[PDB]
Design a protein around this ligand. Structure first.
Ligand code: UPG
Ligand code: UPG
Ligand code: FE
Ligand code: FE
Ligand code: K
Ligand code: K
Ligand code: ZN
Ligand code: ZN
Lengths: 347, 344
């Protein structure tokens, strides 16, 4: 029979991780008698008097938040890393070894509006969000080789506070993913003489099958090797090492691309769409980081609808990540909707 | 200053995967205003007239389940892999490439009792399950190099049907986890001339800090490099390549170990403790597999209680797995409860 990706299971390679993804095109056909998701409330007040993240509010620690009107960053009250933790008793033990971990964790409130997420923020407000990301990265980068900007959106994504915002965790070392991505990109570069992701963008631009968002300076695709159902990869069309290297134009364009990307997500099921997202750029290790290409990953759990997510469990944990629909199907569904948040368009 | 694992963040290495785990011992003290889990109901019928996995019931596809006893295995009505899928077009492209994928998927009903989870089952019944896992492994191993026995238990673990049971997915290739575990174990062996987990078992025996369950032939510990809060690694004290290689004594002993382990898990929060678990053993690839050591991993998501789980999200996906308590603290908590199921 003729192989048909559209219908035959197969594995696809993730050149960033050196790992495969198993695709079973029709897995989703099976009866779902599992957990039903809890979709989020449409009606939240712009200011919650109890919210530990709201402006002019006291934190769990008593610390009072400023009367902030744009973004706001403060050191996490429960940081995952400290800048002066004692060094660990590092050894060579092939079985039980440990290593030192220093760094910090900061919290970023997107805006004082307790009820408005990224797709609902103005391009101007989004641009401030980017400037803050850059600011944070430049400062921490001065001290730590790995600065990780991210965000957990929605209960399904492990958020512990409903205020819109993100986090920044800095590390004295290169975490798993960073070291891997770093090495893999470096090898490709050494061999191909061009940045892996830069070449990837070209290919995607010429194809279109997986394109979701395309702006003057950015591209958002459902990567070939996507893991999560509607997972996306957001990249600059031009070669850029870190977030801190974006030009002002790329910067405002990024704000636009984000709004569009997240609006499509929310438009997909006509609901606030949960996800985990974050930025990957060259580490501040003082090395030649030409092999790098800045990029953001978006990992959303929703699959069938607003109340049915994907669960990366048994097989995925013990063997390999699996997907129940192609990246092409995912991208197509994402292209079908509007890139204007339903709340803003009034449709 | 003076380093103390329960107070200071640090990273631990997982030699099975060659990856690190970030430990931040006081992270769970933060307020939690996130999701609240829904704990599984305690009272369920022994037979559910509408259950697709229940004895004598008609499946989704209309096929009928027999009036079985003990375990019941059938080919998944929506298998994720097939035995005859056409080969993919293989290339050596550095950015966009695919590979073939063949195999099968089977469903294993633990017993005809719709309401009895593993720890609720007798050692005899559990022994029957072990026999089936073995038969299934030996069987599929004839055709596939990778046989994956597993179980998704509880809503939080993405289970799609409440009947107590698991799955077996076979693959014509070695999936990610298999390939790496094989490679790393092989490397270790070549250098140490001893199996990685065999040595590991001894090192743990000589410590006891992370021990949770210990029987004549098995050991269950919160691995040194544990990711999930109360994760455990279950393994035979003696070198055993695959589950099919167990002696009958080892097998009957494994059932005992399983009952004990799972009873402790349920007792931790006095609820049916969810998890994803599976078995890892030598692949059927006709190669020198002495480096292998059979073992089971249990990945339970619960963290603070019956309604609050651990989430591997943002930082974890973009950077590195992280934990809010030490392997040692968790092991202690597990040891603190009775190995007698709270509802026996
Ligand atoms: O008064 C307050 C209230 C909250 N916070 C912080 O606000 C953050 C909100 O972060 P969010 O992204 O919602 O989730 P977290 O509580 O950090 O935990 C999630 O994100 C982590 C990093 O991905 C994971 O390790 C957890 O398992 C996952 O639940 C938390 O870190 C809190 O420590 C404060 O600093 N002060
Ligand atoms: O009439 C029926 C009813 C059910 N089933 C099968 O019963 C199985 C029950 O397996 P379970 O462990 O409960 O979950 P799954 O539905 O397979 O899916 C989970 O397990 C997979 C393997 O880890 C993941 O890919 C998913 O994302 C995760 O939700 C399913 O696969 C069904 O296809 C049949 O074959 N016939
Ligand atoms: Fe990346
Ligand atoms: Fe393993
Ligand atoms: K958030
Ligand atoms: K199950
Ligand atoms: Zn708020
Ligand atoms: Zn049943």
């Amino acid at each position: 029979t003729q192989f048909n990706p559209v219908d035959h299971p197969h594995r696809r390679y993730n050149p960033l991780t050196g790992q495969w993804i198993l695709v079973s095109p029709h897995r989703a056909k099976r009866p779902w008698q599992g957990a039903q998701e809890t979709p989020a409330k449409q009606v939240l007040p712009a200011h919650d008097p109890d919210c530990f993240l709201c402006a002019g509010n006291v934190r769990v620690t008593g610390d009072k938040n400023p009367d902030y009107t744009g973004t706001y960053v403060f050191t996490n009250d429960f940081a995952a890393l400290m800048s002066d933790t004692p060094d660990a008793p590092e050894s060579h033990d092939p079985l039980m070894r440990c290593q030192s971990a220093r760094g910090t964790s900061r919290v970023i409130c997107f805006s004082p509006d307790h009820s408005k997420t990224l797709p609902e923020l103005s391009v101007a407000a989004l641009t401030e969000i980017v400037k803050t990301w850059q600011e944070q990265t430049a400062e921490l980068g001065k001290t730590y080789p790995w600065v990780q900007v991210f965000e957990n959106k929605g209960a399904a994504m492990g958020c512990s506070n409903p205020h819109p915002g993100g986090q920044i965790w800095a590390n004295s070392f290169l975490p798993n993913e960073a070291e891997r991505e770093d090495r893999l990109q470096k090898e490709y570069f050494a061999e191909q003489k061009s940045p892996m992701l830069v070449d990837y963008v070209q290919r995607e631009l010429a194809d279109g099958s997986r394109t979701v968002v395309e702006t003057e300076h950015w591209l958002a695709v459902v990567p070939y090797w996507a893991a999560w159902p509607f997972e996306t990869l957001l990249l600059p069309k031009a070669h850029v090492l870190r977030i801190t290297d974006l030009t002002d134009a790329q910067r405002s364009d990024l704000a636009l691309a984000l709004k569009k990307l997240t609006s499509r997500y929310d438009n997909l099921f006509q609901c606030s769409f949960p996800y985990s997202m974050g930025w990957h750029g060259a580490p501040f290790n003082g090395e030649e980081n030409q092999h790098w290409q800045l990029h953001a990953h978006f990992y959303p759990p929703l699959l069938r609808s607003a109340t049915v997510r994907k669960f990366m469990v048994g097989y995925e944990m013990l063997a390999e990540t699996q997907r129940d629909l192609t990246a092409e199907q995912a991208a197509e569904r994402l292209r079908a909707v509007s890139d204007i948040h339903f709340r803003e368009s009034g449709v």
